[PDB]
């Protein structure tokens, strides 16, 4: 039957695993086969497309490991008469500007970043921390736009709620995973012995979790640390632990919607030249904590907790 690709940069994250599961559902519903491929670097990305072409695939959905590979992906796909849809990470040209012509499906990055900071501040208030001895550790991935709108949004929200701007410290992470964030947080932590309580800002669950793991290694106990991640599905193993940790909760978006809808739209495009909207922004978000994560995932059909 019709074969369609679903290429993701980080197959190890439950976030992409979930996109793959719902693309499969779209396939069963619409009558297509989904070829699931991992594209963790640029070389694998370009090679994977050649592979799709040998398999007979008519197009693919892709979350690129690098926005700057956009030109190349488009050139190759065009050579093979394949339609492409981007999911989560937008393609950019050489200069860093958006390839607005490639359909994109993504979450509302600024808005979810802002919700992260609002919830950080509220939980801080609930605990009664003295602002004078508190600080925000912002672990950033500024070369990736979607990551950058989320952390800027969170810092903006904290500043709007009145968190002192001079107590907001930013540190770049070399990889968007636990090991990179861990390293990044550890180097910021020893620069600030004066701080007794930390707010950890990061664009996704893995980033926040690396930050939390580093604070633990420097002697902070869970009461003095608040980290709220983004993805939701990626935090289930943390929230499932017996004891509470500095990872307070996660903002759960809709990876299920991202997997089904991008796949369904690709299909309609390939099968009926039905042109997708250029930009699909999904605004859904719920805060999951130790207390409600299993109810909330089951309510969304992302069952098991
Ligand atoms: C919305 C998604 O955006 C980026 O691609 C991140 O790398 C993912 O973990 C997920 O948070």
């Amino acid at each position: 039957n019709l074969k369609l690709g679903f290429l993701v940069k980080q197959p190890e994250e439950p976030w992409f695993q979930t996109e793959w599961k719902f693309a499969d559902k779209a396939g069963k519903d619409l009558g297509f086969e989904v070829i699931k491929i991992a594209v963790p670097d640029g070389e694998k990305t370009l090679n994977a497309i050649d592979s799709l072409a040998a398999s007979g695939a008519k197009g693919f959905v892709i979350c690129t490991p690098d926005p700057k590979l956009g030109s190349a992906i488009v050139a190759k796909a065009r050579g093979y008469d394949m339609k492409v849809i981007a999911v989560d990470d937008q393609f950019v040209n050489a200069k860093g500007k958006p390839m607005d012509t490639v359909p994109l499906v993504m979450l509302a990055a600024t808005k979810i970043g802002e919700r992260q900071g609002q919830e950080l501040y509220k939980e801080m208030q609930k605990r009664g921390w003295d602002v004078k001895e508190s600080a925000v550790m912002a672990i950033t991935a500024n070369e990736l736009d979607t990551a950058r709108r989320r952390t800027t949004g969170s810092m903006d929200a904290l500043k709007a709620a009145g968190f002192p701007e001079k107590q907001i410290y930013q540190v770049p992470t070399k990889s968007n995973d636990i090991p990179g964030a861990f390293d990044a947080a550890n180097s910021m932590l020893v620069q600030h012995p004066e701080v007794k309580h930390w707010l950890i800002v990061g664009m996704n669950d893995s980033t926040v979790l690396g930050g939390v793991r580093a604070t633990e290694g420097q002697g902070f106990k869970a009461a003095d640390i608040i980290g709220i991640g983004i993805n939701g599905v990626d935090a289930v193993s943390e929230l499932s632990k017996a004891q509470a940790t500095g990872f307070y909760g996660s903002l759960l978006p809709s990876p299920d919607v991202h997997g089904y809808k991008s796949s369904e739209m690709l299909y309609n495009w390939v099968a009926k030249d039905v042109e997708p909207p250029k930009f699909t922004e999904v605004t859904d978000v719920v805060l999951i904590t130790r207390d409600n994560f299993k109810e909330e995932l089951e309510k969304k059909g992302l069952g098991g907790k």
Side-chain angles (χ1 to χ4, degrees), residues 110-122 150-155 157-158 199-205 208 226-230 249-251 285 287:
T110 299
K111 283 320 169 168
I112 289 126
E114 297 175 345
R115 178 61 176 287
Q116 177 187 79
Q118 296 166 350
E119 303 283 353
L120 285 176
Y121 201 82
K122 183 220 258 54
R150 287 176 259 196
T151 56
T152 294
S154 189
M155 286 177 306
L158 281 161
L199 301 184
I200 306 307
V201 165
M203 70 106 164
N204 61 8
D205 288 330
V208 174
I226 302 158
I228 293 169
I230 299 174
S250 182
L251 291 170
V285 71
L287 171 77

Side-chain angles (χ1 to χ4, degrees), residues 252-263:
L252 169 61
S254 286
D256 49 326
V257 175
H258 296 205
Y260 196 105
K261 213 173 158 54
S262 66
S263 287

Side-chain angles (χ1 to χ4, degrees), residues 9-10 13 15-16 19 63-64 87-90 106-107 109 144 146-147 150 176 203-207 230-232 234 253 255 258:
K9 56 170 182 181
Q10 284 180 254
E13 288 186 348
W15 175 262
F16 287 116
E19 285 185 350
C63 178
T64 188
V87 70
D88 303 316
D89 293 17
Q90 183 172 39
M106 81 179 281
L107 51 63
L144 179 69
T146 184
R150 287 176 259 196
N176 298 321
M203 70 106 164
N204 61 8
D205 288 330
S206 286
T207 305
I230 299 174
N231 289 358
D234 300 356
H258 296 205

Side-chain angles (χ1 to χ4, degrees), residues 39-282:
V39 290
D41 67 23
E43 185 190 354
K44 287 173 183 181
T45 297
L46 295 179
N47 289 344
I49 301 171
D50 283 341
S51 182
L52 286 174
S55 284
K58 315 317 285 58
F60 55 95
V61 179
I62 184 169
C63 178
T64 188
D66 178 12
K68 286 193 157 182
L69 289 157
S71 301
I73 293 159
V74 169
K76 262 220 191 273
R78 330 212 187 255
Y80 292 131
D81 293 322
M82 284 181 170
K83 300 281 198 267
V84 181
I85 291 188
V87 70
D88 303 316
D89 293 17
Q90 183 172 39
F91 291 7
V92 300
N93 63 12
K95 289 148 293 174
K97 260 75 108 141
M99 297 182 36
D100 282 330
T101 67
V102 176
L104 166 72
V105 175
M106 81 179 281
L107 51 63
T110 299
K111 283 320 169 168
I112 289 126
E114 297 175 345
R115 178 61 176 287
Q116 177 187 79
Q118 296 166 350
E119 303 283 353
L120 285 176
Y121 201 82
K122 183 220 258 54
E123 173 61 11
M124 180 180 91
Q125 284 193 127
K126 199 167 310 15
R127 293 192 193 185
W129 293 349
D130 174 356
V131 77
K132 317 190 219 109
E133 45 200 30
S134 298
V136 169
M137 178 183 300
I139 308 170
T140 72
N142 279 350
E143 336 65 20
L144 179 69
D145 191 76
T146 184
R148 200 179 67 248
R149 304 215 283 101
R150 287 176 259 196
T151 56
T152 294
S154 189
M155 286 177 306
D156 282 350
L158 281 161
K159 289 190 269 217
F163 191 98
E165 268 195 287
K166 50 157 163 65
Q167 291 155 220
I168 300 182
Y169 314 108
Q170 307 179 45
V171 58
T173 177
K174 286 126 233 140
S175 50
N176 298 321
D177 50 17
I178 296 183
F182 177 95
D183 280 335
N186 211 54
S187 77
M188 177 61 55
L189 289 165
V190 297
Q191 295 181 37
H192 295 277
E194 73 279 4
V195 175
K196 316 292 186 293
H197 328 276
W198 290 95
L199 301 184
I200 306 307
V201 165
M203 70 106 164
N204 61 8
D205 288 330
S206 286
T207 305
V208 174
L209 278 170
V212 168
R213 294 295 95 78
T215 68
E216 293 171 347
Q218 290 300 323
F220 287 85
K221 73 199 187 249
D224 297 300
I225 300 301
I226 302 158
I228 293 169
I230 299 174
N231 289 358
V233 292
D234 300 356
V236 163
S237 80
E238 189 73 10
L239 295 174
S240 282
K241 287 180 175 174
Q243 295 190 231
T245 74
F247 187 93
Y248 173 68
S250 182
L251 291 170
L252 169 61
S254 286
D256 49 326
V257 175
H258 296 205
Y260 196 105
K261 213 173 158 54
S262 66
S263 287
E264 161 195 34
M265 289 184 306
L266 180 64
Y267 174 79
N268 286 333
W269 190 10
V270 159
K272 318 153 192 171
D273 187 40
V274 172
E275 267 292 78
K278 286 297 182 196
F279 182 58
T280 297
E281 188 175 70
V282 177

